[PDB]
Design a protein around this ligand. Structure first.
Ligand SMILES: Nc1ncnc2c1ncn2[C@@H]1O[C@H](COP(=O)(O)O)[C@@H](O)[C@H]1O
Ligand SMILES: Nc1ncnc2c1ncn2[C@@H]1O[C@H](COP(=O)(O)O)[C@@H](O)[C@H]1O
Ligand SMILES: [Ca+2]
Ligand SMILES: [Ca+2]
Ligand SMILES: [Zn+2]
Ligand SMILES: [Zn+2]
Ligand SMILES: [Zn+2]
Ligand SMILES: [Zn+2]
Lengths: 524, 524
């Protein structure tokens, strides 16, 4: 049999440095995980041992830490080139800086192919970008070849800033003719590498004839065979076996996110490229694996410009930014309003004639706001100041919630009001009135929401059966602060931009800010 | 006797072209007035006839039309140089583009002295600006000399953008030692030329010993001896005679605004520089005076870049901008909210530790909003589009109003509700609730206002005895739309920036706008 070792990462999201167990800042080095210097050690060890190795990335290297804010993808090309990645699929967050922010730092500087079969360009962009990403690449591996076919979330226009000159086609529709073309070119081993999420990965494995393996991402899916090595709870076995429409067993893999794990799948192929067997497991990149000293020293050199950037003025405030618990856990606070306005600004995407913007609404746990910012330092706001407000390394995500779910979340917001608890919600595009004399669960007396399917934004009563898009912290999307109804009832969840970066970009855009408390939250 | 003819302009406010009778756009050329080409004809005629002539400007050439938006003061230096002005005092609006926007287009390019005795600089600015404006200039006139001593409103920090490196001193305190110094240098004829308003001009005439004549501005004061030639109603005789503390009769002059009139005062001096007599009147620059063909042709050449600018994209909207009468005369309209947000943004000035900003509040007659803007032209907004919304050539002014006055204005706003009348008010920094079932004059049931003397802006009930700063159209400050209570009860009024320019700057700053209707105005 011909044996291939697939090593794979996805949704690394700017975790160039080692992290804590929860993928936020590394505080206790001896317990820290991931980062590219540790990944280099482990990939080097595996490449010593296994003859036929591919190292693949399923997208979303962009967006997540100050590394991306400052280096804008140059860090991705540089450190993925140092690791000698064999191929990468485009993720949604590779469009966060527009097509121009993908072409210049990443497509022009990567020394490996960057893939997506379901993105097409029109106009002058088509000539500008031609061949800078590819539908597939055929790579030599020992004396064999392997075809790698890329794909990217059809939803990317709602989840990033790709512009109006790219079209994201249905994945399966685009992939099939490319896979059939590779078989006519005598390429009998085919990996589908792409960035649409675990549910679409299973559909691709099921329906795209000739795909042997699916390496996916986007959904931060953790798969494992056995007792899990850390806190992540598996969504299924590694690999996840799909039975294809033509009767083949097709492994589907993913490797969580944030560079915490290295995916590792061993495939045995027969002479005709049929999979005989597949087995493996993600490897937890814990402190038992040393950081490569060379890569670490390069990371430490690149860190200097981050430390310099962290104390630069982003913009000014002329108002005290009240991020105190005594305000933000009890009533509308102007820091809360600022953060939710930045969250809605971050989620302005290209719109139909059918909506002014696809999302208008924001909730934010007040316990997630961890500092005020004083305006008496000549009004300056720095990244360092924002990192005190937002220290947890979260994201501002996009969910779809029925009105009934969101009414339950606002009841939960005040169910035990008066204890300085974190679940009290700050808001944008929502006006809420509580009556704290009512029974817990019946305290919301008015709840009005800003329309999306309207040319003039205005407020209407929340409808229990209607599904709303909402921007909220990943902490809440995952049921933090007791919001089990959000986790259990949400209809869609896509991870968004780094919390600090959302607020820093908005302050930079606005130059001078003066958020008010204006009656988004009232008590009767 | 030695006879001097003083020709003088003030508060020209970018009226380079001839205007209508009300100083807005010229529509019927045969009835149009002012403009620099007509002023040139009349000044040339007077200089043929009178041996001893000074042509003086008392400030506020900057700000008023698209000329200033595009040329940023280059037009002022160029056309005041073509008219051969002898001297200009700095006005408050000469600081609208900061000190840098005064130094580069105007102070470096004017071929006449620019004066102010009561502005001092500190730090590196002092060395940068030294001698580019002067406290006074001694000018030869025939075989005599005349001293011209400048002054500028002490209030300029609240009325423009001078920065924190200039100090505006009390006028009389600064002027006196300069006037006494000129008398020690055998300069016995002294004109005080400056920009503080008619009330301060009278105080200067009264209290600054040795001033022979005061030529003023800022307050747009029209003075006339006799039956007035047009629609402006005189505030007093021309000249206005002040009896000085030392017993002299000191003429005070001003010449309205907008280049409609040329001030003309004849002074007879004795050998010791004592005024024997003074007489004159402003000259209405009507269509009986021909536009100089050379200056007109130069104006027409400079107009090309204005016409080009007028159709350039300033920014984008993703929302319909609802400037319809059916909205803006009946309820909160999002165009109204946009314009009032731009008015408050325009009035962000340097603040104490005592306020986040000196003004927080805005009212705008809904009948003053004359068009919507459709978002379906790729979202583009041009100056031409804004000029359809705001066609009247007004300004957004700063007034001080007692709470009682403003409550009367909100009652007037709905006194005859339901007829599509213009007085219905759009707002910023005010939340109002009407109950239209109540009697006219008793329909305002809640009126809350955004604090200024606060580090976190928030809303509190309006207080009847408290004096509020409010930004509002000059049309309303002057009692338009029946707001006689505003005109009759206001405590302070300063003219502000051109209406169109306020909105264009805000849209340019914001890049992408999405104003909502959000409950600033409600009906019970
Ligand atoms: N990882 C997290 N992301 C966001 N908010 C968090 C996170 N961890 C804790 N919080 C917030 O912090 C509050 C607890 O803060 P404290 O009462 O100061 O210990 C919780 O109720 C949450 O609102
Ligand atoms: N010069 C002006 N400046 C501002 N608003 C004005 C001016 N002239 C008229 N208006 C407004 O136009 C309304 C009359 O418009 P209309 O009913 O369309 O004739 C008035 O009630 C005012 O609100
Ligand atoms: Ca095969
Ligand atoms: Ca004298
Ligand atoms: Zn991701
Ligand atoms: Zn993704
Ligand atoms: Zn003026
Ligand atoms: Zn002025």
């Amino acid at each position: 049999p011909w044996e291939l070792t697939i090593l794979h990462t996805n949704d690394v999201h700017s975790r160039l440095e080692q992290t804590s167990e929860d993928s936020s800042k590394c505080v206790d080095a001896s317990r820290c995980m991931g980062g590219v210097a540790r990944l280099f050690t482990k990939v080097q060890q595996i490449r010593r041992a296994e003859p036929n190795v591919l190292l693949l990335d399923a997208g979303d290297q962009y967006q997540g830490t100050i590394w991306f804010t400052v280096y804008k993808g140059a860090e991705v090309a540089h450190f993925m080139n140092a690791l000698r990645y064999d191929a990468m699929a485009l993720g949604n967050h590779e469009f966060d800086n527009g097509v121009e922010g993908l072409i210049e730092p990443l497509l022009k500087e990567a020394k490996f192919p960057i893939l997506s079969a379901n993105i097409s360009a029109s106009g002058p962009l088509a000539s500008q970008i031609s061949g800078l990403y590819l539908p597939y690449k055929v790579l030599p591996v020992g004396d064999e070849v392997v075809g790698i076919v890329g794909y990217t979330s059809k939803e990317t226009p709602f989840l990033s800033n790709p512009g109006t000159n790219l079209v994201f086609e249905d994945e399966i529709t685009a992939l099939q003719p490319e896979v059939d073309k590779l078989k006519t070119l005598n390429v009998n081993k085919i990996i589908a590498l792409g960035h649409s999420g675990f549910e679409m990965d299973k559909l691709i494995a099921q329906k795209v004839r000739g795909v042997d393996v699916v390496v996916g991402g986007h959904s931060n899916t953790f798969l494992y065979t056995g007792n899990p090595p850390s806190k992540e709870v598996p969504a299924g076995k590694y690999p996840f076996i799909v039975t294809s429409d033509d009767g083949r067993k097709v492994p589907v893999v993913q490797a969580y996110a944030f560079g915490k794990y290295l995916g590792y799948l061993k495939i045995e192929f027969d002479e005709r490229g049929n999979v005989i067997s597949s087995h493996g497991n993600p490897i937890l990149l814990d402190s038992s694996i040393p950081e490569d000293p060379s890569i670490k020293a390069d990371i430490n050199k690149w860190r200097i410009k981050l430390d310099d950037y962290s104390t630069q003025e982003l913009g000014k405030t002329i108002v005290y930014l009240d991020g105190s618990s005594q305000s933000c856990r009890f009533r509308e606070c102007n820091m809360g309003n600022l953060i939710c306005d930045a969250m809605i600004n971050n989620n302005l995407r290209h719109a139909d004639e059918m909506f002014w913007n696809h999302v208008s609404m924001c909730i934010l746990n007040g316990g997630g706001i961890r500092s005020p910012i004083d305006e008496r330092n000549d009004g300056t706001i720095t990244w360092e100041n924002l990192a005190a407000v937002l220290p947890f390394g979260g994201t501002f995500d996009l969910v779809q919630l029925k009105g009934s779910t969101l009414k339950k979340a606002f009841e939960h917001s005040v169910h035990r009001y008066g204890q300085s608890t974190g679940e009290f919600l700050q808001v944008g595009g929502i006006h809420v009135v509580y009556d704290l004399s009512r029974k817990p669960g019946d305290r919301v007396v008015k709840l009005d929401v800003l329309c999306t399917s309207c040319r003039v934004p205005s407020y209407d009563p929340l409808k229990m059966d209607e599904v709303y898009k909402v921007i909220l912290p990943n902490f809440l999307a995952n049921g933090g602060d007791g919001f089990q109804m959000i986790k259990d009832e949400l209809l869609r969840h896509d991870s968004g931009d780094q919390d600090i970066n959302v607020v820093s970009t908005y302050i930079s855009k606005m130059k001078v800010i003066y958020p008010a408390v204006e009656g988004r939250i009232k008590f009767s």
